[PDB]
Design a protein around this ligand. Structure first.
Ligand SMILES: CC(=O)N[C@H]1[C@H]([C@H](O)[C@H](O)CO)O[C@@](O[C@H]2[C@@H](O)[C@@H](CO)O[C@@H](O[C@H]3[C@H](O)[C@@H](O)[C@@H](O)O[C@@H]3CO)[C@@H]2O)(C(=O)O)C[C@@H]1O
Ligand SMILES: CC(=O)N[C@H]1[C@H]([C@H](O)[C@H](O)CO)O[C@@](O[C@H]2[C@@H](O)[C@@H](CO)O[C@@H](O[C@H]3[C@H](O)[C@@H](O)[C@@H](O)O[C@@H]3CO)[C@@H]2O)(C(=O)O)C[C@@H]1O
Lengths: 246, 200, 226, 21, 113, 200, 246, 21, 21
């Protein structure tokens, strides 16, 4: 009612010569917010021998206060490719590992799994056994050394493997006929596939997972979790910054 | 007024079945009408009636019901219309929404029920395809949702993509009685796969 | 024939935001196509084309009773890190950044029964003085009048007023780009009702949409919860 | 979205990433 | 050739708990084979799944682990010129790949089992 | 060879219902296949297997079955193919027919069964749309019947218009074993009326 | 008979609206499945002195459960070029080798062979002798160091050398007039040629063979070996995966 | 088949691999 | 004879080798 200002008048609000543009919104571009490296996870290695476990690239669980945590929670359905950096930190005296040969293998959404030592390198007694799937072949293997290695890390790009045209970050259903608990918001292969780190370290070190999700596609906006306690009435939420009264 | 859930419904036949496809004439997927519940004077805000479609209440669609019984999968939308009944002396409002893979449900999955959302949610419920039911303005919320989900069609026995929230915003303030909520679901663009055998 | 190269000083350093990508190790993957509706492109769109519901003492509405006068009914420090925003979309989206910019639209939906009527002065008070405390005090400023019973819902635009080309998504001890003012709804009259024994109060929901000129910048990582 | 170098296409559009239909 | 018989080849969708009699499967996708019209017959086990792709490596029943059940049933029995010579019949059963059949994501071999 | 029962089937919709009409896609009224019985060496002529369509065996059409369950009436034809299995050392013949309002059945109505016709009948059975199954010539009788009856459509629960007779003309003479009869019914041009309620 | 569905009808099957395409089969492209690195073999070195043995690149024997094992067994006749990676692992304390100079030489299908020390490097007494054919010349030599060598490996491409227009992975005949055992599925130079690794390590290390076969050409499909035990009746073969009930 | 870079032809088609007739 | 790269001319024909008359 009445609209454009100055007259006390009922529905009549005042004028607003709305703003110009700068930045063209671009930072809030879902594809851009997601194409960078995130420190998601931290895990330890496996000994070259034993009958070890594969690890799963599932950045959909969350709960850890991390920005990329939420954001993936912001949408119902997601699709993007993957990109890694694995860094391996030291947890003892760095002079313990002279070699430090690390085997890594990537497993695509839905690959077979049981592995036991099965490859045997020998030479001058002693002789090493690497893992049955640590080996090089079909799924990409990546071997790197950490011995003065100016950056104890390795890295690469890996495609959207799932058999699902998109991934439901939420699922009002079960992924199995047996409607068991655990099988709730599940639906199998709703992730990026898996990896196996294995080495004569394993002890002496932890890892550093890092994902970069290029080509981000987000479908169906969802409620965006608060992330901070509710401040008191009629007040602000004061925080420490690059600004502030010095 | 008519509000669309993300997009008008497509009668396209499933990108993932070489298997023979029965399309459902309205006259099969007919129309269904039930009472959700009686919004009462006590139920503080944040409450809600979860209506995950269609299950729990699927036993009651007695025709549409029937074909989805003896058939493995289905793809279909939903014309749905929530109808609260109250006089002009009542106050209060709800917000009813269609939610994609809604979940919390304390695994009472696919069973309609009642809950109290966490708040950040009712605050942001509106971020989904929803409509406002304001007791001094209207008495009907009307929505239409399309098939949706990771698969190009699913098993309604394991998954319900669409689920109506009927959220309590401003408490029911006014005459002592309750205000009965109600809802008419009627399947849009229904399509089945693989007939299952005989119940023996 | 070998190329002559000098190894730039940082050479073996990592850096987590490289504008470039890593080497592929699984090529030739063609992906299945997705119809799946509502793919959003940019976060500002849902924030603009979408109303969130405010936060006051825990509820998303404020009350009018058959007794009120000039006591301000709704008040908020215009800052994203303000209270009555805490619950909302816009506010929470902005946590993902450093600087915000523009006007915000407020939607008040009076929800008292039709037998009922009332009026309010929604006003915006510029960040100088020490905050008004009565209608007759705020009135001299930007405000409009809402007679519930003409529109049962009304929109009000909290403008962007600042030497600041951009503003602070993360406010704190009052700085010059920390606050843009104060939103206040006051009660112009009180609750008139057909029968005051049934309808004695009214609940006005208050929602917040993002401003058309609204924008966000400089993505940031999360500090310690607080 | 965020890929900005020139060498970003050192590898093919086919090899590098994934491809829709 | 002195012999004849018929079968109901049927495909039963991965829900229930598997049929156990012809009259049970019959309500589903199937055709009829009267050996003595064609001495060989082809039957196409279709692809039915929300799954854009399926599992080459199956296991404890998942939603993309199975696509159903193939079943041949005996429509009638073995009629023969002289039942003391021909009392039974052997139907070979071969499998060709489907025209829409495809495979993806090459993998390395796990422990034999 | 294909033999027609009085006339090709009409997909016309019932001259007697202002009431909404669901037509049945093949994919609903699919195809069904069962064994009638084992024609044995002892059963002297005049015997027969009565197959009044479809009842008794209606519980087993598990899809078509389903829609006719929750619906008052239906009009439909029948593609039906009776298949005796026997070698070239067997002799004998039957005559299988489609009969309009067949009756005798000792009121074991709508239940398939076995009988011995009066004779003037088997002699004149052929006066109906029938086909000959001669063990030195063929091994299949094939017929297709159209909707028929006093009403322009009926209740399949009370009336079965079509009914297959499978009559024994010349006894089964030859190798000691029996010759299994069989039959594939599949509804043609199906059409329903009035959905009935829910089974509660 | 009858074909396109719904009528109980004899030869009449039901309809099948066959599928769309995605992936264009491409992964099953023999040329693509073969152009990557495989961990085929593992061998030890030879001392710079003695009268050592050449090693043979014959990836046609098989028997080892390895994917590339079968696959080469999938065809009667094969042709592709070769590509290597040799990695040298350590089998003792990595601090034992200060230098670790390794000589490698590649020998093309049908090269001469007897080698004894024959090259003498001298300087300040002691003096090293390398192998008569370890030397650099006609057949490619590759010398690399393993002393902090951030990747103890070396690598290169080598052409189809054989005098056979193609290689029979199977041979119903003998390669010699003397129809002896051993000379069965043989036919000489039905392989890639050979290599000699030699170094002041030899003890202290094993190697890591890896082949990549570009330009793969496979002629005459053959039966493809099962690779897993036969499961029980009317059951599946349950396996561990990236999916599975958690 | 699987060679996808640009530098894949850093070396000649003649030098790199083998050549048919 | 045996020079086959592209970078083989990283240096000039004049600088690299020798030149006849
Ligand atoms: C995938 C696989 O087959 N793994 C098996 C490994 C690999 O074949 C092996 O590491 C290849 O380098 O080998 C295993 O069996 C070997 C083991 O029994 C050792 C112990 O004597 O002998 C090996 O064979 C010897 C043979 O005895 C010699 O005559 C000569 O030919 O050398 C070979 C090996 O250099 C067996 O292959 C193993 O022990 O791990 C079994 C694995 O399953
Ligand atoms: C391929 C070959 O000829 N191998 C022979 C090697 C090489 O010629 C030699 O390593 C080249 O560096 O040499 C062998 O014979 C040398 C050996 O008898 C030593 C021991 O005295 O003497 C070498 O000649 C000396 C000579 O005595 C000096 O007067 C001076 O000229 O220096 C040279 C060498 O620097 C012999 O050539 C060997 O011992 O291995 C024979 C190999 O067959």
């Amino acid at each position: 009612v009445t609209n454009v200002g100055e007259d006390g008048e009922p529905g009549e609000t005042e004028p607003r010569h709305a703003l110009s543009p700068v930045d063209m919104h671009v930072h809030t571009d879902v594809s851009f917010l997601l194409d960078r490296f995130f420190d998601v996870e931290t895990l330890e290695l496996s000994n070259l021998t034993g009958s070890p476990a594969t690890h799963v690239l599932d950045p959909f669980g969350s709960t850890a206060q991390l920005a990329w945590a939420r954001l993936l929670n912001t949408c119902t359905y997601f699709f993007s490719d993957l990109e890694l950096s694995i860094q391996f930190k030291f947890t003892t005296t760095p002079s313990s590992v002279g070699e430090g040969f690390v085997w890594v293998k990537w497993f695509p959404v839905g690959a077979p799994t049981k592995t036991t030592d099965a490859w045997q390198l020998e030479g001058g007694g002693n002789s090493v056994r690497i893992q049955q799937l640590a080996v090089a072949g079909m799924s990409p293997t990546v071997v790197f050394k950490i011995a003065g290695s100016r950056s104890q890390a390795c890295g690469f790009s890996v495609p959207y493997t799932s058999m699902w045209r998109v991934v439901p970050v939420f699922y009002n259903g079960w992924g199995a006929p047996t409607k068991e608990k655990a099988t709730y918001n599940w639906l199998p292969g709703a992730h990026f596939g898996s990896i196996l780190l294995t080495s004569d370290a394993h002890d002496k070190g932890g890892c550093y997972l890092r994902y970069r999700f290029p080509r981000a596609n987000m479908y169906c906006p969802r409620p965006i979790p608060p992330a901070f306690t509710r401040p008191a009435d009629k007040t602000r939420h004061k925080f420490p910054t690059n600004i502030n009264k010095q | 007024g008519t509000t669309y859930c993300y997009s008008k419904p497509d009668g396209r036949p499933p990108s993932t079945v070489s298997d023979p496809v029965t399309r459902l004439g309205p006259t099969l997927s007919r129309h269904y009408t039930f009472k959700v519940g009686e919004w009462p004077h006590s139920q503080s805000h944040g409450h809600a009636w979860i209506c995950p479609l269609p299950s729990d209440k699927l036993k009651k669609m007695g025709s549409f019901h029937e074909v989805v019984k003896a058939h493995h999968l289905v793809k279909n939308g939903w014309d749905v219309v929530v109808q609260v009944n109250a006089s002009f002396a009542h106050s209060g409002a709800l917000c009813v929404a269609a939610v994609p893979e809604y979940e919390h449900t304390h695994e009472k999955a696919l069973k309609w029920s009642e809950l109290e959302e966490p708040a950040y949610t009712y605050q942001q419920l509106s971020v989904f395809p929803h409509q406002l039911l304001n007791l001094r303005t209207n008495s009907s919320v009307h929505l239409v949702m399309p098939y949706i989900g990771p698969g190009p069609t699913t098993n309604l026995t394991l998954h319900n993509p669409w689920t109506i929230v009927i959220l309590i915003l401003s408490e029911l303030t006014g005459p002592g009685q309750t205000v009965p909520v109600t809802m008419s679901v009627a399947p849009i663009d229904a399509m089945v796969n693989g007939p299952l055998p005989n119940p023996e | 024939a070998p190329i002559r190269v000098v190894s730039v000083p940082e050479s073996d350093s990592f850096m987590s935001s490289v504008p470039d990508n890593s080497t592929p190790l699984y090529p030739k993957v063609v992906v299945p196509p997705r119809q799946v509706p509502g793919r959003f492109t940019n976060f500002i769109d849902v924030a603009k084309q979408t109303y969130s519901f405010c936060s006051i003492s825990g509820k998303p509405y404020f009350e009018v009773t058959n007794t009120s006068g000039d006591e301000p009914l709704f008040q908020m420090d215009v800052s994203l890190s303000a209270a009555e925003l805490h619950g909302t979309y816009v506010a929470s989206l902005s946590s993902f950044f450093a600087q915000y910019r523009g006007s915000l639209n407020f939607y008040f939906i009076f929800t008292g029964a039709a037998a009922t009527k009332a009026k309010f002065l929604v006003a915006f008070v510029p960040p100088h003085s020490a905050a008004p405390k009565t209608r007759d005090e705020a009135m001299a400023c930007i405000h409009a009048v809402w007679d519930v019973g003409l529109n049962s819902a009304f929109s009000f635009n909290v403008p962007y007023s600042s030497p600041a080309d951009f503003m602070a998504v993360y406010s704190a001890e009052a700085t010059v780009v920390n606050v843009s003012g104060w939103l206040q709804v006051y009660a112009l009259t009180a609750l008139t009702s057909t029968d005051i024994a049934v309808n004695s109060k009214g609940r006005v929901l208050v929602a917040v949409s993002a401003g058309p000129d609204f924008s966000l910048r400089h993505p940031v990582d999360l500090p310690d919860k607080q | 979205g965020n890929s900005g170098s020139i060498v970003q296409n050192f590898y093919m559009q086919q090899y590098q990433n994934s491809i829709d239909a």
